[PDB]
Design a binder for this molecule. Sequence first.
Ligand code: KUB
Ligand code: KUB
Lengths: 284, 293
Amino acid sequence: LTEEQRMMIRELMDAQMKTFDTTFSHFKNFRLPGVEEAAKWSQVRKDLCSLKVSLQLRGEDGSVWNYKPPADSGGKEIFSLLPHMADMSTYMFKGIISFAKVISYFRDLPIEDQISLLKGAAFELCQLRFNTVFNAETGTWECGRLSYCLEDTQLLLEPMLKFHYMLKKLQLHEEEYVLMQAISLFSPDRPGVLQHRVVDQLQEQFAITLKSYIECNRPQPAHRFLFLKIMAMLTELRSINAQHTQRLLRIQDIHPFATPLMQELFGITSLTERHKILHRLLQE
Amino acid sequence: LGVQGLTEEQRMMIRELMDAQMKTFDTTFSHFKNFRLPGVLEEAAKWSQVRKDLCSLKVSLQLRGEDGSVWNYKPPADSGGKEIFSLLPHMADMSTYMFKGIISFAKVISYFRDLPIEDQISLLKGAAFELCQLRFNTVFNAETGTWECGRLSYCLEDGFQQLLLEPMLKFHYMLKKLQLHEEEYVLMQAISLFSPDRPGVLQHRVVDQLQEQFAITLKSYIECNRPQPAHRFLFLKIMAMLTELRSINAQHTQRLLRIQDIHPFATPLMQELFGISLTERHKILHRLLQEGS
Ligand SMILES: C[C@H](Nc1cc(F)c(S(=O)(=O)Nc2cscn2)cc1Cl)c1cc(F)ccc1F
Ligand SMILES: C[C@H](Nc1cc(F)c(S(=O)(=O)Nc2cscn2)cc1Cl)c1cc(F)ccc1F
């Protein structure tokens, strides 16, 4: 309700509008699939077997291209979709870097802390953004004309998939999603963060603003614990991020797939010296 | 009876055509590659006649990979624009691959090689489409309405009432219901190939003499391997199908020319085979006939 909190929300909403391509209209020129080490490979097959999707592409003319992924025989076939996913990820991360760049509170932080927080949060803000275009009924991320759909076997076992169903079930507003994004972004306990106390205070103010928004703009006591439900989802998302970073690195080690922007974000081969693309993107 | 009921020359004749079929028909489509696909993401009365045929023959396209995956292309509903032409480049590439197989098929048959070069062109110009349709029917699944071309599958769009009107589809459903042997398919290809009354045939009599012996051999073959009353009048049924196919060949050429006129899609070989000295204009055909094997 306070005017600072109103302008705080309006800044994030403005940011989200300027930087989230909801229709995926500008995502193009992306790749598609074609037409001791054993212990690493065993683990990498297990990693990919959880998060399998079919890919649907609706043409401007009314046509539909549908990709169904191969069953694991035990070879490079399991990596089929990695080049496409990397391009989609990279496209999404560029959106998140822009999102952070228009927040005044973020720009005021030293560039090393801006990098550290984006390293920490990029994945989480992608997943939060992907949740807004997720369809729980059909199990499908509707990315404009491009569309990722889960394969059968149940699915709820995989922490990342469980997260998407649970968050979507909360039926959050646009304002609540951007406030989740701000709380994730401004996390004081990410590695390499010098200004711990300032970021912690900013996080608190975003949390209070969300807590106050839910209190004021929703029925009570119906949504009595909704702020805490959101906080549980952020903690659970932070856990998934750690799990994800491990999985990606294991895969990368065997089968190099990551774009240069991803390599920097996940720590693949001074803080500004090691993250030159990210640094360049934050200056421009 | 078995093959003992055929003369030595007839056994030899069938043996040659079958050997030829085996050497020149890639039934799994392993060597068909580097083809176009539909891209990812008073005059007006002509457009009407083009649209009507292309509706009936509309197919979805499936692409299995050795890795295990499937790429599936469902084509667009008629919006009233260029979208109706999206599969033509592909279909033209598949056609050209099939035609190269038919040209190779003709080449290894002795009776064809001994003809003059101009007749070889004239007969292939006359029978290319026919022999392709005969080959396509051998991979046609009637239950699913799908031509199963190994890794490629072309599947008809959604049933039988609308589709059995269209002569080319009706042809495929009818010929499949006869349940022909390989030997009967290759002898149909011979009878179509050796047609004495194609345009530009100089050796009318020698081609006619050859045709008659292939028809005689087919009749004798049927009589030696078809004892049951399920296959009554099978020879005459087959010959009526070849007459029907030649009608569909005329109707097909006239579609192609109408489409090519408004939306150019044909490969240089298709231009030669459909006309878009005899040897000089038919440059690629002449080349392919000289290359042997
Ligand atoms: C919609 C969402 N897409 C998605 C999620 C990612 F984490 C990445 S990544 O961070 O770049 N890592 C990565 C790339 S190839 C293997 N790992 C990229 C994408 Cl496109 C998604 C979520 C899910 F639970 C199951 C399937 C999905 F497609
Ligand atoms: C399987 C077969 N495909 C096929 C048929 C053709 F006639 C030609 S063509 O002769 O080159 N001319 C042509 C090229 S683009 C339109 N016409 C090529 C192909 Cl690949 C088929 C048969 C059918 F009855 C209905 C649909 C079909 F796709």
